[PDB]
Amino acid sequence: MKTAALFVSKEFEEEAIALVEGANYKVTSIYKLPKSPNVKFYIQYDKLQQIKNDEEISTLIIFEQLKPRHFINIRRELKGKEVLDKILLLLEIFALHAGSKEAKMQIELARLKYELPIIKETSTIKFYKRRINKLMKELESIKIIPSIGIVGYTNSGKTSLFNSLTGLMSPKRYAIPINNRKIMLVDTVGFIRGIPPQIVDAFFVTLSEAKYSDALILVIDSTFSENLLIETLQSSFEILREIGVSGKPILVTLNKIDKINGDLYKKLDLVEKLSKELYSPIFDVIPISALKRTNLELLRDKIYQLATQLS
Ligand SMILES: Nc1nc2c(ncn2[C@@H]2O[C@H](COP(=O)(O)OP(=O)(O)O)[C@@H](O)[C@H]2O)c(=O)[nH]1
Ligand SMILES: [Mg+2]
């Protein structure tokens, strides 16, 4: 596929894996961040030589923000093999999920702005600012069958749910038949934790495409403690309100129920009471396991009923 070597702290590893896969990479190797980073190469020189020459690794991904000197030196070595740091990784995730011209322009504006300090540390500078100025110009100027979008935080199992329904391009829109009805399933970008300031506008503009969909499926990790559940739901419904989602039916799926080892009904009833406190209209709240294929027919049937309600 696209294979990545990923450098990440233990604290972020789980999260960064799910991010790398949202950027359509397979993680084929994982290393901690270097204790004592290399002034030139950030990662160790011998490691960089191995990755340089390993035709099974297409891309180096470092879950941190790299200095311009690191980019210059890494890109030199890799010789056409790609390096993403954390900002460029998330811009890649956005680029793969964005279908609108406005989002595409914000992503490109961010990527241009991020290259500037790299070029400055290396006329080209002038070429880049003219494009940056043009896009900013055009952005300030633009400012003046049923579709169900899948939303939720990273690692909640949005891709697992989509794959499971589809039986599986960018952006990912995939029509499926349920009974006698055709339904368009839309992979929206996730809610993302810890978004670097530089890319917040590209993030929100990409996410705000969720308002194109007739209805939404909101995916929530059931393994979360009760107070983490409350917070996740408060923040999901916070964000949806602020991007201008209003009156769209929302089907909430409490996922990963297989991994709960614990009280599913109390979790379910908490999620249901709270989601209905925070938002209207809630279509329904159901428990599933997208991995273990638990309650998939329930999910199926509820997507069909919701599609019947929309039509
Ligand atoms: N145990 C369990 N794991 C799941 C389930 N759904 C997804 N996952 C896993 O959790 C991680 C996040 O899943 P993914 O579908 O990519 O989440 P996303 O970042 O929101 O798209 C992946 O390792 C999935 O295999 C589930 O129902 N149960
Ligand atoms: Mg995913």
Side-chain angles (χ1 to χ4, degrees):
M1 196 199 315
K2 270 159 147 205
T3 45
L6 167 74
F7 294 66
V8 57
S9 74
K10 274 297 163 185
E11 168 188 18
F12 302 124
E13 178 171 320
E14 197 179 8
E15 259 274 355
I17 291 165
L19 299 165
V20 171
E21 292 177 353
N24 199 24
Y25 290 90
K26 190 162 171 199
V27 178
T28 57
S29 63
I30 307 160
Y31 301 96
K32 290 189 200 185
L33 296 181
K35 296 153 211 208
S36 285
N38 183 299
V39 193
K40 295 169 62 168
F41 296 104
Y42 182 79
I43 60 168
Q44 302 154 310
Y45 187 72
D46 43 18
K47 205 75 207 189
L48 187 53
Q49 302 312 311
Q50 277 187 294
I51 293 163
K52 172 197 282 193
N53 282 153
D54 190 334
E55 319 167 335
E56 312 285 78
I57 296 157
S58 66
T59 301
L60 175 51
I61 306 168
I62 297 153
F63 205 64
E64 247 298 3
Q65 180 179 330
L66 300 168
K67 291 139 106 179
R69 65 157 181 281
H70 301 319
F71 270 109
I72 283 153
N73 281 131
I74 305 181
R75 287 172 174 177
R76 214 200 29 245
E77 292 307 308
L78 287 183
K79 293 217 187 209
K81 284 195 179 183
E82 175 174 46
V83 50
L84 298 179
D85 75 340
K86 181 186 265 161
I87 296 205
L88 283 191
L89 172 68
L90 295 167
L91 285 159
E92 184 83 9
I93 298 181
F94 308 167
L96 297 176
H97 294 75
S100 73
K101 198 166 266 167
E102 181 188 358
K104 290 293 215 342
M105 285 168 88
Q106 289 284 1
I107 291 153
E108 163 86 342
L109 180 56
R111 287 178 157 168
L112 287 177
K113 283 185 146 164
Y114 211 59
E115 255 331 277
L116 273 188
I118 308 172
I119 304 159
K120 282 171 172 282
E121 276 269 314
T122 287
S123 178
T124 294
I125 313 72
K126 284 330 159 227
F127 179 73
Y128 281 68
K129 309 153 114 169
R130 300 188 293 279
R131 202 174 160 72
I132 280 163
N133 286 340
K134 186 196 185 218
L135 281 166
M136 305 209 270
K137 195 211 88 35
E138 301 168 325
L139 283 166
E140 174 90 349
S141 155
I142 92 93
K143 251 54 93 40
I144 308 151
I145 73 157
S147 250
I148 308 309
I150 288 52
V151 300
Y153 268 93
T154 307
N155 215 33
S156 64
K158 298 185 308 303
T159 301
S160 299
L161 193 145
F162 186 94
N163 283 351
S164 170
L165 289 166
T166 60
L168 292 191
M169 251 71 92
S170 92
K172 265 158 58 205
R173 301 182 58 87
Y174 189 92
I176 51 158
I178 300 178
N179 300 327
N180 59 342
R181 284 182 191 278
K182 185 173 173 193
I183 295 121
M184 178 65 66
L185 291 178
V186 175
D187 198 4
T188 89
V189 74
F191 311 137
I192 292 155
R193 304 172 172 99
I195 305 174
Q198 299 55 45
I199 71 173
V200 162
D201 286 347
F203 170 68
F204 284 111
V205 172
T206 304
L207 185 59
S208 290
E209 303 177 12
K211 78 191 62 166
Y212 295 151
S213 287
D214 304 306
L216 301 177
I217 292 166
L218 172 62
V219 196
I220 307 291
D221 188 341
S222 74
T223 72
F224 279 176
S225 77
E226 297 191 34
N227 302 142
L228 193 35
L229 273 173
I230 286 164
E231 182 175 320
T232 306
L233 281 166
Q234 286 163 336
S235 156
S236 300
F237 278 119
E238 185 187 303
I239 288 159
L240 288 173
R241 173 165 169 178
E242 297 298 315
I243 71 180
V245 171
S246 35
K248 303 159 191 55
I250 297 188
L251 172 56
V252 185
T253 55
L254 187 59
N255 190 35
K256 310 190 168 189
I257 69 181
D258 53 294
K259 282 165 75 166
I260 274 197
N261 316 103
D263 203 322
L264 177 55
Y265 185 81
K266 271 189 195 86
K267 277 178 151 179
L268 188 75
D269 186 67
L270 192 249
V271 169
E272 199 182 331
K273 291 171 148 131
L274 186 55
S275 314
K276 284 168 197 210
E277 267 171 37
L278 299 163
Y279 182 95
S280 180
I282 298 300
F283 185 79
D284 210 336
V285 185
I286 64 174
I288 62 171
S289 168
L291 174 79
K292 283 310 170 139
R293 282 164 315 260
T294 318
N295 275 171
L296 299 196
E297 182 68 10
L298 185 60
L299 179 52
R300 176 178 175 289
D301 289 339
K302 294 288 179 178
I303 294 348
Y304 182 84
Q305 296 157 34
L306 170 60
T308 298
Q309 177 182 298
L310 292 170
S311 76

